[PDB]
A paper describes a structure:
Caveolins are a unique family of membrane remodeling proteins present broadly across animals (Metazoa), and in vertebrates form flask-shaped invaginations known as caveolae. Unlike vesicle coat proteins such as clathrin, COPI, and COPII that cycle on and off membranes and share evolutionary origins and structural features, caveolins are unrelated in sequence to other vesicle coat proteins and remain integrated in membranes throughout their life cycle. Using a combination of computational and structural approaches, we now show that caveolins across evolution share the ability to assemble into amphipathic disk–shaped multimers composed of spiraling α-helices and a central protruding parallel β-barrel. Each complex forms a disk with 11 spiraling α-helices and a central β-barrel, with each protomer forming contacts with two protomers to the left and two to the right.
We used single-particle cryo-EM to determine a 3.1 Å resolution structure of the S. purpuratus caveolin complex and built a model spanning amino acids 29–152. Residues 1–28 and 153–159, regions predicted to be disordered, were not visible in the map. The complex, ∼130 Å in diameter and ∼36 Å in height, is composed of 11 spiraling α-helical protomers organized into a disk with a protruding β-barrel. The variable N-terminal region extends along the cytoplasmic face of the complex before making a 180° turn at the hook structure. Amphipathic α-helices form the spoke region, with the α-1 helix forming the rim of the disk that is ∼15 Å in height, and the C terminus of each protomer is a β-strand that forms a central parallel β-barrel ∼30 Å in diameter. An unstructured detergent micelle covers the hydrophobic face of the disk and reaches into the interior of the β-barrel, suggesting both regions interact with membrane. Comparison of the experimental and AF2.2 structures shows the computational model did not correctly predict the length of the β-barrel or the curvature of the disk. 2D averages of vitrified S. purpuratus caveolin complexes showed variations of curvature, including examples of complexes with either concave or convex curvatures. Calculated using a filter resolution of 8 Å, these low-resolution structures represent the negative and positive values along the reaction coordinate for the component with the largest variance. This analysis shows that the S. purpuratus caveolin disk can be concave, similar to the 3.1 Å structure, or can be flat. Thus, we conclude that the S. purpuratus caveolin complex is more flexible than the human or S. rosetta caveolin complexes under these experimental conditions.
Author numbering:
A (entry chain F), B (entry chain G), C (entry chain H), D (entry chain I), E (entry chain E), F (entry chain J), ...: 29 to 152
The structure:
Amino acid sequence: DVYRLSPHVTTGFADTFKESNDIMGFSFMEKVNGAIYKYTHFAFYAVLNLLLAPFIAFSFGLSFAVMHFAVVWFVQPIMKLYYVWLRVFNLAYEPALRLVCDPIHRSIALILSGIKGQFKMNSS
Amino acid sequence: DVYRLSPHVTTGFADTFKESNDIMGFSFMEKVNGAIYKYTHFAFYAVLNLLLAPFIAFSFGLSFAVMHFAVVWFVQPIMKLYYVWLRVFNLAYEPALRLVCDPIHRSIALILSGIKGQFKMNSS
Amino acid sequence: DVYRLSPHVTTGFADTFKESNDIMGFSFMEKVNGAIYKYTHFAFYAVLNLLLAPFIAFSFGLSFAVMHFAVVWFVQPIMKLYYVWLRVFNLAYEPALRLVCDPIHRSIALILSGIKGQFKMNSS
Amino acid sequence: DVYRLSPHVTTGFADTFKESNDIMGFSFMEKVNGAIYKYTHFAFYAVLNLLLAPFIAFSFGLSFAVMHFAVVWFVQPIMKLYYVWLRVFNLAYEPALRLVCDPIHRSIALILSGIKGQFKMNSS
Amino acid sequence: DVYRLSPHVTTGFADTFKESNDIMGFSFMEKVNGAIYKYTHFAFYAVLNLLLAPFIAFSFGLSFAVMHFAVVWFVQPIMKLYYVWLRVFNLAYEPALRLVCDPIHRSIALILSGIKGQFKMNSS
Amino acid sequence: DVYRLSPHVTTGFADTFKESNDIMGFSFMEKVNGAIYKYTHFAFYAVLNLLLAPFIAFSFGLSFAVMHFAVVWFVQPIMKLYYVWLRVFNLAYEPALRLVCDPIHRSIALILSGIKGQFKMNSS
Amino acid sequence: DVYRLSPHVTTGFADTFKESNDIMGFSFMEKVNGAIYKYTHFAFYAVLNLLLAPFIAFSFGLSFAVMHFAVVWFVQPIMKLYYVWLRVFNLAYEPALRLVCDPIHRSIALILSGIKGQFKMNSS
Amino acid sequence: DVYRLSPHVTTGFADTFKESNDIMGFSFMEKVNGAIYKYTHFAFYAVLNLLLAPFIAFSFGLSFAVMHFAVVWFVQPIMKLYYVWLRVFNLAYEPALRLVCDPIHRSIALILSGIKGQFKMNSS
Amino acid sequence: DVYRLSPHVTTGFADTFKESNDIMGFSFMEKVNGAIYKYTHFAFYAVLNLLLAPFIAFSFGLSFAVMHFAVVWFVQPIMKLYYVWLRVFNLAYEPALRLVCDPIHRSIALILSGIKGQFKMNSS
Amino acid sequence: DVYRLSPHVTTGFADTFKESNDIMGFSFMEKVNGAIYKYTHFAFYAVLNLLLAPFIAFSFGLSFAVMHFAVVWFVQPIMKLYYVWLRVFNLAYEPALRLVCDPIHRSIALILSGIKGQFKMNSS
Amino acid sequence: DVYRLSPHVTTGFADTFKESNDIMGFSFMEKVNGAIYKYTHFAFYAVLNLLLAPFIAFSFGLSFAVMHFAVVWFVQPIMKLYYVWLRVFNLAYEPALRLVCDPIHRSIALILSGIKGQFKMNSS
């Protein structure tokens, strides 16, 4: 699928404040920092979602409805008529080109008709 | 098939307002937002379809009827006559070109007639 | 076959007014729209076919008869005489070219006569 | 065979007035149109064949007789003498060219005499 | 994943003050040096972490909350509309280009339709 | 064989006045036309052969006798002496060229001595 | 690992004062020379290590502590924000480029769709 | 063998006055023509051979005797001395060139040391 | 290993005063010459080794001690800090380049997605 | 072997006065001509060999003795000293070049580390 | 081995005065000529070897002793110090180059990630 949104960027605590085996502090502070980060993030995202989510959903639902009706019932039939004319053109175009092109490429194919070889193998 | 309409763009709620394991709000708001979006979309598309669909179908059915009659009963026989003349031309064109081209390419094919080699293999 | 007419453009109702899982109206309107489209198309194509088909068939049958007689009984024997002369020319042309060309390409073939190699493989 | 006439162009009724599953008229008219086309074609070709075929056959038989006698009994022996002289020239031409060419191409063949490699494979 | 932080740089004592079999001092000094290095590193990192970690976590949690809300609920729907228009353009663009391009590349494909060869193998 | 005459051009009745399944006349006229063509061809070729064949055969037999005696007993020994001198020249030419050429091409062969790879396969 | 220190230079006695089977002195002098070299090297390296090692270890431990704190807690979050913006740009960039590029490369792929060949093998 | 005379040109009756299945005269004339040709050729070649063969054989035997003595006992030892000097030159030439060339080509060989791949297969 | 001394030059008596099967003197002189050469070589190398070896060993042991201390305890930590900065730069550099480069190369990969072929084999 | 004399030129009676199946004289004359040729050749070569062979052998034996002594006992030791100096130069030359060259070619090797493919096969 | 003397030039009697099956003299003279050649060669080489061999052996033994002492005990340690500095330079050089080069070559590797194909085989 070409029109699929690519995956998000990992942002978890251990994926953004990342340490190796050589880097350490006190053990108990890790949980405190992680809890602070996670709860701040959640508490600030949730209120915005609750306050502003419905209106955007309504607006974009209505907009997509109109867009999809237009596409399905005015664009596709026109494209089909266009395709009819394209086929009519191809009927005249393709054979005429093949006439002049095919003999040359059939002739050039004779370069690969003389292969011969000998081989010997060993193993242990 | 060349003249086939390509697949649509995914637009479902979870495919347009997409989140990862790091992004969350309150659980119950998800269903509310999804229901609002889906029902708005359906209720706005259905009325337009009901009101305006039949006339477009009638018009394009009539148009396609005329187009297809023209194509089937005036274009294809003409193309067949054209093809007859094309074959007549090929009869004279192809052998004359092959005469001058084939000897050269048969001669050049001799470059691949001297392959020899030796090999040894091991495994464990 | 070079002179074969390419396949038609799909034009069925579900192949021109095409929808996905995300796009829906009322269920019953689909059958109404499909019936309107199909019956309009058929009723408009059938009358034209009935009224105008025979004359075109007669005319093109007569035309093709004349064309094919001309091709079979005046063009092909002439092409055969032409081919006789072409063979006579080739008898003199091909050996003379091969004389000067073959030694060079036989000599160049010696580039591929010194292949050697060693290998070892593993698997699990 | 180089001097063989290429196959004809398909011209049958269903191969020139061609329809798909989407294109239809009344059922009975198809047989009427096909019969009209086929019988017109046959009735117009047969009379011309009967009236004019024998004279063309006689003329071209006589012409081909003369042509083939000329080719068999005056051209081929001359070509054979020409070939004798060609062989005499090759005797002097080929070894002299091979003298100067072969050492270089034998030397260049040493580029492919140092292949070595290692591999490992897995499967499941 | 494109947006993943690359692994750290190894900095352990034996990985930064590295010696070979040819380089040696007294045995007991190795432990003294290693202990000094490790404990200095830990004692200086831990205090900074304890003193300054929470505020940075809070700030970046709040910042990421705002950023992610913006991305999820204002950018993606706009991109989806953009994709709708892109599909509409492709419907007209692709077949027209394929019409003129495909015959040429189908014709050029005939260069690989004349392969022949002979081989002989030996083993021991 | 380089000096072999290439095969004739097919000229039989059904190979020069050729028809397909779509092209037909009355059945009985086919045999009449074929008989006329074949018998005219044979009756015109046979008399010419009978009247003029022996003299050409005698003349070309005598001519070829003289030509072959000249070739066998004056050209080939001279070519053998020429070959002796050619070998004498090669003795001095080839080693001197190989001296300067071989080291370079042995050196360039080292480009293919570092191949390594890993693979994994699946099947069902 | 990109940031790993490469292996040392071999410096052992037999690896720096190296002889072959053709080069020999008295047997007993080899041990004397080896002992002198090894003990001088060890006695001069050990005192320097003992005298100067601890201070360098302390200094670099403190320095690395500060550096790693800076990297972990000020650089990585900024890079993550940068990555968010990069993803937003890619959403608009990639599909638009693929629209114009893919048809051409799909068309060019038709060059490899006409392969045919025949082979014969022998063994002993 | 480089100095071997290439095969003669076929000149038999059926190989120079050649006909196909489409070309025929009276049956009995074929044997008459063949006998005339063959006996004329033989009767004219045999007398010349008998009259003039011995003197040419004597002359060329004497000439080849002198030529071969010269080659065997004056040219080959001189070529051997020349070869001695050539070897002396190679001793100095080859190692010096390999010194400057080999490192570069060993270095360039590293381009083929990073191959990896995955595959899947199906059959029926 | 890059910093390993390459093998010596063979200098044994039979490897420097080398003869073939065609070159011979009296048998007993070979042993005399070999003994003279070998004993002169050994007697002249041994005294120099005994007289001058220890001082060079002492000097180079001391020198290498100082060099290795400098390398291990002043260069490597600095290189590690440099590597830290290099990683910090890469974090910003690599994703930005991949953004603009990957779509193009993914698109160009479509040239190899249309392979088809047919084959036939024989053996005996 | 580079300094080996290439094989002689075939000069036997049937290999220099060569005939095919189409060329014949009286049977008995063949033996007469062959005997004359062979005996003349032998009788003229043998006397020259007997009269002049010993002196050339003596002269060239003496000459080769002097040449080979010079080569074995004055050229080869000098070449060995030259080789010693060459090795000394290589010790300094090769690592320095590899330093600057290897990283680039290791980097360029990454072009072949992304191979993937799918296949399907059929047989009968 | 690079510094190995290449094999001698064959000089035996039958390898320098070489004849084929077509070239012959009296049988008994062959042994006389061979004996003369061989004994002259041996008798002239042996006296020179006996008279002049020892002094050259002594001189070159002494010379090689001095040369090898110099190489082993003054050149190799210096080269080792040089190698230490070379490694120090590489530590800084290689990662910096890999930083800018690797992303580009990883990106270009995506050209080989789209292979697909179909095949059919036959045998008899």
